[PDB]
Design an enzyme around this catalytic site. Sequence first.
Site, PDB file in Angstrom:
ATOM      1  CB  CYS A  86     -16.599  -2.886  -3.061  1.00  0.00           C
ATOM      2  SG  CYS A  86     -18.057  -1.812  -3.046  1.00  0.00           S
ATOM      3  CB  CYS A  98      -5.433  -6.581   0.105  1.00  0.00           C
ATOM      4  SG  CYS A  98      -6.777  -6.336  -1.077  1.00  0.00           S
ATOM      5  CG  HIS A 155      -6.429 -16.719   7.010  1.00  0.00           C
ATOM      6  ND1 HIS A 155      -6.504 -16.088   8.226  1.00  0.00           N
ATOM      7  CD2 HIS A 155      -6.129 -18.041   7.219  1.00  0.00           C
ATOM      8  CE1 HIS A 155      -6.261 -17.007   9.131  1.00  0.00           C
ATOM      9  NE2 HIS A 155      -6.028 -18.205   8.573  1.00  0.00           N
ATOM     10  CB  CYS A 208     -14.680  -5.377  -0.849  1.00  0.00           C
ATOM     11  SG  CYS A 208     -13.029  -5.020  -1.547  1.00  0.00           S
ATOM     12  CB  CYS A 253     -10.465  -8.593   5.110  1.00  0.00           C
ATOM     13  SG  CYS A 253     -11.027  -9.089   3.442  1.00  0.00           S
ATOM     14  CB  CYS A 265      -9.211  -3.687   4.866  1.00  0.00           C
ATOM     15  SG  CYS A 265      -9.535  -2.822   3.311  1.00  0.00           S
ATOM     16  CB  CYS A 271     -14.869   1.650 -10.013  1.00  0.00           C
ATOM     17  SG  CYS A 271     -15.587   0.177  -9.196  1.00  0.00           S
ATOM     18  CB  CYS A 319     -10.942 -10.602   9.854  1.00  0.00           C
ATOM     19  SG  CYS A 319      -9.829 -10.559   8.421  1.00  0.00           S
ATOM     20  CB  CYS A 328      -3.046 -12.358   6.866  1.00  0.00           C
ATOM     21  SG  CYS A 328      -3.354 -10.988   8.019  1.00  0.00           S
ATOM     22  CB  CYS A 361     -20.780   4.587  -5.482  1.00  0.00           C
ATOM     23  SG  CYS A 361     -19.061   4.069  -5.209  1.00  0.00           S
ATOM     24  CB  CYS A 420     -21.315  -2.573  -8.840  1.00  0.00           C
ATOM     25  SG  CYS A 420     -21.688  -1.759  -7.274  1.00  0.00           S
ATOM     26  CB  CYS A 460      -5.506 -12.790  14.504  1.00  0.00           C
ATOM     27  SG  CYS A 460      -6.839 -13.469  13.486  1.00  0.00           S
TER      28      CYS A 460
HETATM   29  S1  SF4 Z   1      -6.375 -10.716  10.527  1.00  0.00           S
HETATM   30 FE1  SF4 Z   1      -8.010 -11.768   9.079  1.00  0.00          FE
HETATM   31  S2  SF4 Z   1      -6.705 -12.551   7.339  1.00  0.00           S
HETATM   32 FE2  SF4 Z   1      -5.196 -11.950   9.032  1.00  0.00          FE
HETATM   33  S3  SF4 Z   1      -4.731 -13.947  10.197  1.00  0.00           S
HETATM   34 FE3  SF4 Z   1      -6.495 -12.968  11.269  1.00  0.00          FE
HETATM   35  S4  SF4 Z   1      -8.520 -13.704  10.266  1.00  0.00           S
HETATM   36 FE4  SF4 Z   1      -6.687 -14.256   8.906  1.00  0.00          FE
HETATM   37  S1  SF4 Z   2     -17.815  -1.694  -6.943  1.00  0.00           S
HETATM   38 FE1  SF4 Z   2     -18.151  -0.440  -4.950  1.00  0.00          FE
HETATM   39  S2  SF4 Z   2     -16.730   1.309  -5.410  1.00  0.00           S
HETATM   40 FE2  SF4 Z   2     -17.141   0.427  -7.527  1.00  0.00          FE
HETATM   41  S3  SF4 Z   2     -19.093   1.420  -8.249  1.00  0.00           S
HETATM   42 FE3  SF4 Z   2     -19.812  -0.457  -7.040  1.00  0.00          FE
HETATM   43  S4  SF4 Z   2     -20.257   0.435  -4.858  1.00  0.00           S
HETATM   44 FE4  SF4 Z   2     -18.909   1.919  -5.977  1.00  0.00          FE
HETATM   45  S1  SF4 Z   3     -12.030  -5.549   2.121  1.00  0.00           S
HETATM   46 FE1  SF4 Z   3     -10.513  -7.348   1.988  1.00  0.00          FE
HETATM   47  S2  SF4 Z   3     -10.482  -7.837  -0.266  1.00  0.00           S
HETATM   48 FE2  SF4 Z   3     -11.447  -5.756  -0.107  1.00  0.00          FE
HETATM   49  S3  SF4 Z   3      -9.653  -4.282  -0.296  1.00  0.00           S
HETATM   50 FE3  SF4 Z   3      -9.869  -4.676   2.018  1.00  0.00          FE
HETATM   51  S4  SF4 Z   3      -8.380  -6.402   2.456  1.00  0.00           S
HETATM   52 FE4  SF4 Z   3      -8.719  -6.352   0.203  1.00  0.00          FE
END
Ligand code: SF4
Ligand code: SF4
Ligand code: SF4
Lengths: 487, 275
Positions: free
Chosen positions: B156, B238, B200, B259, B256, B250, B16, B229, B203, B13, B118, B223
């Site tokens: 992603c 992250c 987690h 991804c 989250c 995220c 990246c 999540c 987090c 897409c 991907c 949370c």
């Molecule tokens: S927000 Fe998501 S990663 Fe953070 S403590 Fe809660 S379930 Fe775990």
């Molecule tokens: S990994 Fe996600 S952001 Fe990267 S090319 Fe694939 S769909 Fe697009």
């Molecule tokens: S979706 Fe989860 S693993 Fe992906 S960038 Fe957001 S916090 Fe990080």
Amino acid sequence: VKISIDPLTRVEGHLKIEVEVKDGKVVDAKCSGGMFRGFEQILRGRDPRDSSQIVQRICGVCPTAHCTASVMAQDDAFGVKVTTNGRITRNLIFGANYLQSHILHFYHLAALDYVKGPDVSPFVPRYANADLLTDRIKDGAKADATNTYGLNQYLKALEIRRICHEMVAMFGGRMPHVQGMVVGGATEIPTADKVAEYAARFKEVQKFVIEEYLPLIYTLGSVYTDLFETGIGWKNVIAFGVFPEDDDYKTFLLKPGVYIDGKDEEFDSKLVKEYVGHSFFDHSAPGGLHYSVGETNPNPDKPGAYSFVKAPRYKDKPCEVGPLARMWVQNPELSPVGQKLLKELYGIEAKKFRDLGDKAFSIMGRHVLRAEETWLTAVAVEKWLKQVQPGAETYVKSEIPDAAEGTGFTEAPRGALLHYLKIKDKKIENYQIVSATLWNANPRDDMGQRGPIEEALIGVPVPDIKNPVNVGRLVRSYDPXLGCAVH
Amino acid sequence: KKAPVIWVQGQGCTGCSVSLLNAVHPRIKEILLDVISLEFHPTVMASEGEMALAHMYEIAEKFNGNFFLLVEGAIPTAKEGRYCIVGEAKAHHHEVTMMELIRDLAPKSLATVAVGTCSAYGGIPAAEGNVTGSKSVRDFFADEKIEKLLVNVPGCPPHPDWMVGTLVAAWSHVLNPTEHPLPELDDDGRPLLFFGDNIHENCPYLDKYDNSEFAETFTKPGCKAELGCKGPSTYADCAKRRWNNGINWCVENAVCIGCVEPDFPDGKSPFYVAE
Ligand code: SF4
Ligand code: SF4
Ligand code: SF4
Ligand code: FCO
Ligand SMILES: [Fe+2]
Ligand code: NI
Ligand SMILES: [S]
């Protein structure tokens, strides 16, 4: 003489352009979208709410546009009425990427057809007779000054586009692919602090648009005046409306509208259909399908087909989309910079967009509309930063309906965008996407009418078949996103 | 010396690539002018068509065994690879499918780096419902019997630090292997440097989680577990690095969605249903 260009670079996605040249001019053209993923197939059977995340992956350049269209389709289907702060917050998330996208496009995708970059990859290789500012301006010092002026802006824009992504991330979570827009509104209520941070970043971006981007656009056009007279096409344009200014979606920053055969008309979604006569898809019925009943049955073998891009038509007429379409439809007043520079550099007295008159419809007219729209969007973002209310609810909790339909309308930076969602047994039954570049980069329809880009290519000067610069220039003025066009 | 790079896109897409443009360690201008020599990239390169393809093939031979092949997007094998045509070679006709390009280039590369979920694991294009026979680079390598170092930098999109960091580490190793080690990889071929941590466990909402305080809504405190999540089953850094120059992430913003995982999206779906 035939010329094929695959890949046509500095465009998003996989694009192949083929033209026939005769007497120094393009006499015929074919546009092909060469990569298919099938989002309309992949989404089937899924929890409808997942679509706002999944459809973002259609394009990493304009994910917020798809996310917006998707959450609106879901709001519609789920019967959710967004809050005022939710509507404003989604405009702020999306507006920051309108700025990013246009800036990204002009400098990083279109500018290398005019600006001579340094002698290191990926700036070289390039056509030997590229007709760059350095080839056009005969006075050495002026040529160096203008090329350097443009190049330094290209480089600074790399940083400017990054700051717009910090702005998207402020309420969007991250970028590419935001987490902040869901059916029901926005997931994060804006704090006074975060609004101030977005505003401070925003001020830097706005300053660049006004002091650098607009001035370069108009200056560039004054060197390439011949480019305000080719790359015309159909002259039919369509817009669905973007950035709702009120909670009932009665008003937009740029209004929905159609301009076909010289007449302005109000937009009616019932007249939108997609043809697949020369596309790699099978339809259950001839004559084109309205999006609410659209089908996605890929067929790379279909005799006569040459692209994965379907062919959208409004009242059976090909219509182009994008900044030019929105600006022509809305006819806003031009920026102070444009008004002054059109007088000083071209001897043109203009106050409104349509004062460009005749050729707002050209290679340069498309770049001008996009620059002006950037300034226009920036004026609006500054207004939204004042309307947003720190602490006010941005989210309404809704439930997945057992069976429903929903349609989301908006305008992606590249043009008109709609998402149609159909739910059954609380799952996605059908999901149809009619997206931006789809309207511009489509192949011939069943009746044989060329897509807007193929049509605009007809007449483009190619005095040098070995260095066919204007073909790529015309294509890039549309800012095509093939990932979006095909999905 | 700059690391030679040939960046190819299949079923991607361009997300990246855009994520890389957002890099700050170092910024994109320094990356392009001082770190790598981006020889081929369809989105930003000056040349087009035959000139672009010929330059790519020229670099692949001249730098045979000395260029990193970066892959963005999945590889579709159905219909003889016709769901992704990356080009058209000058030698009369010859449409090149993504399958053909990778089969050709990967064996000549120093290493292949699959950026994005991907190319690394298949991702969205390879999710349930696709009819393109969409494949990850690792699955394609196995089918093709390609024996080449492959580093997976998922996400992603992947955060620019993961992409840049992995490539800088790999290049330093190529330059002076006995002094600069290759990034240590997990079983899914991704760098432990960036994918060793569990979201987690790291987090900031963990204490709320342990005290059973869950946000009932996106805009209520607590949370995000109940909102869907997937941090508990997701490994990326992250929570410490965050996104877009530390502006947000995220989990703080919403949830989250896992991804970076090989099972994204199907194994992380529904996104708004608690694990
Ligand atoms: S927000 Fe998501 S990663 Fe953070 S403590 Fe809660 S379930 Fe775990
Ligand atoms: S990994 Fe996600 S952001 Fe990267 S090319 Fe694939 S769909 Fe697009
Ligand atoms: S979706 Fe989860 S693993 Fe992906 S960038 Fe957001 S916090 Fe990080
Ligand atoms: N902008 C953008 Fe993408 C395209 N074309 C969508 O919709
Ligand atoms: Fe579609
Ligand atoms: Ni796009
Ligand atoms: S967007």
